[PDB]
Design a protein around this ligand. Sequence first.
Ligand SMILES: CC(=O)N[C@@H]1[C@@H](O[C@@H]2OC(C(=O)O)=C[C@H](O)[C@H]2O)[C@@H](O)[C@@H](COS(=O)(=O)O)O[C@H]1O
Length: 722
Amino acid sequence: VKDTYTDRLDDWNGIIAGNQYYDSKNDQMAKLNQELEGKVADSLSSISSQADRIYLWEKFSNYKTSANLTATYRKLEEMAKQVTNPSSRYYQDETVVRTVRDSMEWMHKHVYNSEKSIVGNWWDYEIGTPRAINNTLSLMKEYFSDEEIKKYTDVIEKFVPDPEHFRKTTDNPFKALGGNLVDMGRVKVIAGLLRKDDQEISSTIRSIEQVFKLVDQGEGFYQDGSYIDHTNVAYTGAYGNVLIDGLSQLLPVIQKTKNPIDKDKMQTMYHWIDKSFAPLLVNGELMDMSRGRSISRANSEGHVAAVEVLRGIHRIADMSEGETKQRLQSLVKTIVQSDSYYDVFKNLKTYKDISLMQSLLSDAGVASVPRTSYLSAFNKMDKTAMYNAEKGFGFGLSLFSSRTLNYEHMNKENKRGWYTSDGMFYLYNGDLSHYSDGYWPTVNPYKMPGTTETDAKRADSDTGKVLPSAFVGTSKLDDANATATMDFTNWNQTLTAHKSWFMLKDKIAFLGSNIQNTSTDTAATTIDQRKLESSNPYKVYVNDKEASLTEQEKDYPETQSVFLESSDSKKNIGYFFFKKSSISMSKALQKGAWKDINEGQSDKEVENEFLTISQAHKQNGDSYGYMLIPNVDRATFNQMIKELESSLIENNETLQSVYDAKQGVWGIVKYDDSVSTISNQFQVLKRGVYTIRKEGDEYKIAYYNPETQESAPDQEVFKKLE
Ligand SMILES: CC(=O)N[C@@H]1[C@@H](O[C@@H]2OC(C(=O)O)=C[C@H](O)[C@H]2O)[C@@H](O)[C@@H](COS(=O)(=O)O)O[C@H]1O
């Protein structure tokens, strides 16, 4: 029956598919249409048309595997999209209409109904499938009776009757929050509209409002921009994605129901965008350190994942007004145009999303100015993101502590992320494809960049762990300078190291001290493991003399510097060792398959060439110290290392500090409360992290105690001499 409920469903259809905006003369849209045409065509030619079939699609036949249910229903949603698209060859096609109706009935009688119990993954039974069912019925509501719709959605009410909890029919339900809570809306709000159930709609919207509250513990968004999910995992880039992506779709519909959400409550959305999401986006790429186990998915590499956030932002901009709308449009525009590697349209899956992106990009009224420099210390999730606009490089520092899990391996995904948070670092430069094109299934998991580890074998069956120490954190001074440390202990408590980082605007110093090993395994710190481009080869220099790297590891004793020279300076990487160090390097083709790190992925062999730089630690009390200097040519790197000749102030078991004379900035990490005199100019008095700047006779201080997660009054930690 046509009423206010169907009106809302019409708006929903315009959002999830957008057929009403389709334009055959629009190349980007025609491209998505053809994709859907192909998908439906394939589904129609492989579906079982035999009586007494045991499945609809052979490749999704074993229904004891919950994933097959969601995949099956999603195939029906694709059909519903095309049968209602005037420009589709399947528009109002009698066979497709009957196929969708008959398929819904079959699955309802033999595979998914209220008389069933969760078998496999609860996610499919409560989120994946219900969403596919809602969208199918919503798109084809003019081909189904209200009774049939209520019939096919009853099962949704059986598995998800409570808008505040998930796994309600199991022996271990959980409180819905963040991304899941948004999906709860895409389940119960839509089902509610389909069932014309006001109570379900009102109660679900009320439950959804919890998402707008910032937290100070648990899952959710924090004031410092961090986003935690799954109890204690940094997850802005995956579950955070689902949250903004899904919520931006729902809001236009929710705000037109009899239970609209207060404007002041939704105000936090803008905080997420500016404080939580934006910093993790560099040249169109969403930083992998925030994507959890999703890094092990071939179809979700960095630039692809970024689009989920960008399209969410764009939708929010569209429902916003004036300056707020104007600036969000500019944010999306500048990020997209800075991405010369990935075509944003490849992940805009609805015509309205394509339309919005096109108008934004062609509207001269929307400014597209390169983003300025920034540095976000996401202490509540132990990650740090840095971007230098003048030089054009991004830097990501992935850590963990007693407050966060190192890596997430579940549902057979991300089997080898063991060391992705053990002081791992990311460098975002001219090569936007670096962490893409199969980086994850080909990178050597035992040598993640920046990490200090023993070479003991690791089991894929292992799961994440929290760190024994709480002494992990970043002290930020300004948009270009910050200091961080990690009181590191490896997975089996056989190795330790005081690892610290000194972010000094256009370079980052890496210092490690108190390195100890109690095992029989060899210990080493991976200085880098950079994925190469066959089109842009690097010329390697050691102590400024060209070197020839081979697959076989070569040792370089008494090394003062290493320089990776590209034809594009924005891809150059230099390493300056404060004190001559013994390192080894090699360039080798590494092979692997996505299935190796994610059971549900392809076993197709992938290959990439990598340049690995390492420093062995054969004695207790060992250390390392070097400055990472990117985006400068060879002569400029050589000049810079001369300026930094005496930048290392100290690197021992209780004190680590680097000084940038040009800036007048000090980065300092103290492991105890002894009085530390620095450069005969001042004293720092407490255990913690410092970033200090001298401006004449003045001193600007940024102190952070990572264990108590508090700063402190200046006189408690700093004292000027004389
Ligand atoms: C945040 C996350 O990893 N969520 C998991 C699901 O993944 C998301 O799926 C969708 C969607 O519209 O369904 C959008 C996102 O890009 C993607 O991250 C999914 O993996 C389900 C079930 O698993 S599967 O059978 O292995 O595919 O589990 C969620 O936790």
